[PDB]
Amino acid sequence: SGFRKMAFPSGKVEGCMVQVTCGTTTLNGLWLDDVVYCPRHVINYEDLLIRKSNHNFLVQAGNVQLRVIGHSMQNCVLKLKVDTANPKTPKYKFVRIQPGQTFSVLACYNGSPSGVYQCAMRPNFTIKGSFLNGSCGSVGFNIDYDCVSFCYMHHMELPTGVHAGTDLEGNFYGPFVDRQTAQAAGTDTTITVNVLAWLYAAVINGDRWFLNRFTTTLNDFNLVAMKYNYEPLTQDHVDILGPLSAQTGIAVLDMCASLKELLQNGMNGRTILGSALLEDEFTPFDVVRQCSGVTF
Amino acid sequence: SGFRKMAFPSGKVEGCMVQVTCGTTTLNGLWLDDVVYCPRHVICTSEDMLNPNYEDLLIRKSNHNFLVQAGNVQLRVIGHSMQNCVLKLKVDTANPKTPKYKFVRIQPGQTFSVLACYNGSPSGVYQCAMRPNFTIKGSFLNGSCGSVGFNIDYDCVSFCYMHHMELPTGVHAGTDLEGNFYGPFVDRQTAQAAGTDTTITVNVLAWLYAAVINGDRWFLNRFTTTLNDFNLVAMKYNYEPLTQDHVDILGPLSAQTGIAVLDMCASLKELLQNGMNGRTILGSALLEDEFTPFDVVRQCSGVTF
Ligand SMILES: CNC(=O)CN1Cc2ccc(Cl)cc2[C@H](C(=O)Nc2cncc3ccc(NS(C)(=O)=O)cc23)C1
Ligand SMILES: [Cl-]
Numbered sequence: 001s002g003f004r005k006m007a008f009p010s011g012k013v014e015g016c017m018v019q020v021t022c023g024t025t026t027l028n029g030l031w032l033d034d035v036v037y038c039p040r041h042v043i044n045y046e047d048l049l050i051r052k053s054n055h056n057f058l059v060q061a062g063n064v065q066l067r068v069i070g071h072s073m074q075n076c077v078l079k080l081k082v083d084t085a086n087p088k089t090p091k092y093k094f095v096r097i098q099p100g101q102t103f104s105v106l107a108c109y110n111g112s113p114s115g116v117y118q119c120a121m122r123p124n125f126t127i128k129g130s131f132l133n134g135s136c137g138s139v140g141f142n143i144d145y146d147c148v149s150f151c152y153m154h155h156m157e158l159p160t161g162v163h164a165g166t167d168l169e170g171n172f173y174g175p176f177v178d179r180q181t182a183q184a185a186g187t188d189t190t191i192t193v194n195v196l197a198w199l200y201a202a203v204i205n206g207d208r209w210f211l212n213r214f215t216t217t218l219n220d221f222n223l224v225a226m227k228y229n230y231e232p233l234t235q236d237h238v239d240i241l242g243p244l245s246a247q248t249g250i251a252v253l254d255m256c257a258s259l260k261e262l263l264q265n266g267m268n269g270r271t272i273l274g275s276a277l278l279e280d281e282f283t284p285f286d287v288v289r290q291c292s293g294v295t296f
Numbered sequence: 297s298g299f300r301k302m303a304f305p306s307g308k309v310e311g312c313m314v315q316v317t318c319g320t321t322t323l324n325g326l327w328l329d330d331v332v333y334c335p336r337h338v339i340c341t342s343e344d345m346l347n348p349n350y351e352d353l354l355i356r357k358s359n360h361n362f363l364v365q366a367g368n369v370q371l372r373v374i375g376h377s378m379q380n381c382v383l384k385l386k387v388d389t390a391n392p393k394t395p396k397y398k399f400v401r402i403q404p405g406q407t408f409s410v411l412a413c414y415n416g417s418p419s420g421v422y423q424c425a426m427r428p429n430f431t432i433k434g435s436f437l438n439g440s441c442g443s444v445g446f447n448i449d450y451d452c453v454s455f456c457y458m459h460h461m462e463l464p465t466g467v468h469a470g471t472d473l474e475g476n477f478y479g480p481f482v483d484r485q486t487a488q489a490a491g492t493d494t495t496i497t498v499n500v501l502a503w504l505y506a507a508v509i510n511g512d513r514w515f516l517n518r519f520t521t522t523l524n525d526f527n528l529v530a531m532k533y534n535y536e537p538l539t540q541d542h543v544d545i546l547g548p549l550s551a552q553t554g555i556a557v558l559d560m561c562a563s564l565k566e567l568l569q570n571g572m573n574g575r576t577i578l579g580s581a582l583l584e585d586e587f588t589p590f591d592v593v594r595q596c597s598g599v600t601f
Contacts (some may be wrong), residue, residue, distance in 0.1 A: 114305070117419060130297075293419060293438075
């Protein structure tokens with residue numbers, strides 16, 4: 001029993017974090033095999049890069065200094081070829097996630113990990129993270145069995161306190177650019193499929209006060225959800241919620257009718273899984289994993 | 297910017313998790329140097345849990361009755377002893393991944409990271425606090441016994457909790473790493489229940505200071521309060537008494553924001569009276585009590601917005 005925002009064990013990623021310094025800027029890098037990946041803003045990027053030599057980049061892994069032997073740019077990510085392969089390189093993949101998908105973040109400063117937390121890629125492509133100056137180059141990841149899937153690299157903070165970054169191939173999530181200019185997070189929406197998953201998690205943990213005898217059509221549910229800034233629920237989302245619907249015996253469109261009533265009438269002084277807000281940062285898979293006991 | 301429930305990086309603890317099996321029971325163990333620490337109820341069956349005589353169950357065991365597995369490697373047990381509610385299994389191999397560590401006993405209101413494990417394999421990490429009633433609101437399923445709580449300061453891991461059981465209300469009870477339970481709990485299936493829980497007042501105040509640092513002051517007011525009058529009001533909402541020690545501990549947060557502790561106490565009094573009126577504080581519609589004054593200082597900026 002119990003429901004917590006749970007992050008993946010960070011050990012495999014901790015062994016990859018390094019400090020990168022170029023001139024007066026210092027941020028974090030990801031050391032995989034003989035390459036260090038970090039935001040290219042550590043340095044017209046092609047014009048700034050051509051003026052740099054290998055010895056201009058200071059890479060530090062713990063107390064050991066790594067020697068840079070080459071450098072190249074891939075989108076908004078700088079790839080520093082180092083002379084030593086990382087002996088702690090885990091099995092890994094670089095993956096691009098979609099809005100609504102969650103991941104763990106290992107927040108680092110000076111190449112040293114400070115904390116780990118869970119978060120979701122918002123529909124507006126920003127993340128509500130906890131980052132201070134020096135956190136650039138911190139990474140987001142998921143773990144499947146023994147393989148770390150790197151999905152995020154931190155690049156910047158937006159005026160509203162939210163965060164923007166790239167996948168590990170340097171392609172930004174969202175319409176953001178890596179420069180000082182007027183940039184703002186677009187209007188955000190609630191991840192509907194995730195709120196439904198978390199309502200199923202509450203039924204598994206014994207919270208059923210919000211259930212009712214009523215059902216709804218998928219179209220009528222979407223007409224109501226569009227009014228409360230909720231993402232449209234698709235037939236794919238309904239299919240994905242299938243195992244949670246089977247484990248609890250509550251049809252997806254019946255859970256949709258419970259959410260329809262909570263959107264109109266609120267919670268009335270009550271809470272769900274210790275929350276007075278409808279929580280959208282747990283995917284259907286996160287609910288299944290936490291209510292099963294999946295290990296790595 | 298931003299404020300999240302942040303756990304310590306779990307890597308140093310992951311390298312210590314092992315699987316312990318005694319007969320038909322399998323749970324987790326903590327491998328530090330040449331010793332494996334685990335809950336002593338690993339030697340019990342379900343029937344034994346009603347009235348276990350651990351000394352009598354233990355005397356019937358030999359070293360080879362304990363199966364310890366570190367990854368795919370089998371560790372050989374060469375000795376065993378009981379210390380309160382923990383079993384200490386002397387193994388033939390020292391853990392090469394043993395971090396610098398201490399065993400510390402925490403007080404209610406203190407937070408820590410939990411590495412939830414099943415079959416000696418870590419599955420997830422989360423942050424939580426020792427509640428005033430000595431239970432923890434964790435997320436544990438069957439097989440999680442032996443999972444540990446810890447803090448990491450500098451390169452030193454301070455182990456403070458080992459998971460032993462789930463109470464009827466879904467909350468959890470465990471021991472320090474010397475086997476002494478937190479709270480009036482026993483490692484026996486008895487009619488024991490979590491006592492009435494209360495809100496950790498010093499932590500709610502710390503989190504209100506964190507909201508001020510991150511640029512939010514809507515909840516402040518022009519009033520102050522005496523410490524005694526604040527406690528008379530706070531006890532009515534099931535909040536823990538705020539002591540002079542708590543006021544002293546909140547000093548650096550009071551200085552960084554320029555808001556006196558008893559002035560923040562007056563805002564808390566009003567927030568309890570009024571609720572939030574559709575507003576949130578650090579993305580929460582409830583008053584959050586699982587961030588200590590020390591957690592706020594560690595996570596938040598040293599410059600107020
Ligand atoms: C609620 N479980 C029980 O009534 C049985 N328990 C009795 C008992 C009594 C004292 C001590 Cl020290 C240990 C224990 C055991 C115990 O609490 N371990 C567990 C710990 N944490 C989460 C757990 C979720 C579930 C779970 N068991 S189950 C198949 O789902 O019933 C055990 C869990 C076993
Ligand atoms: Cl303490």
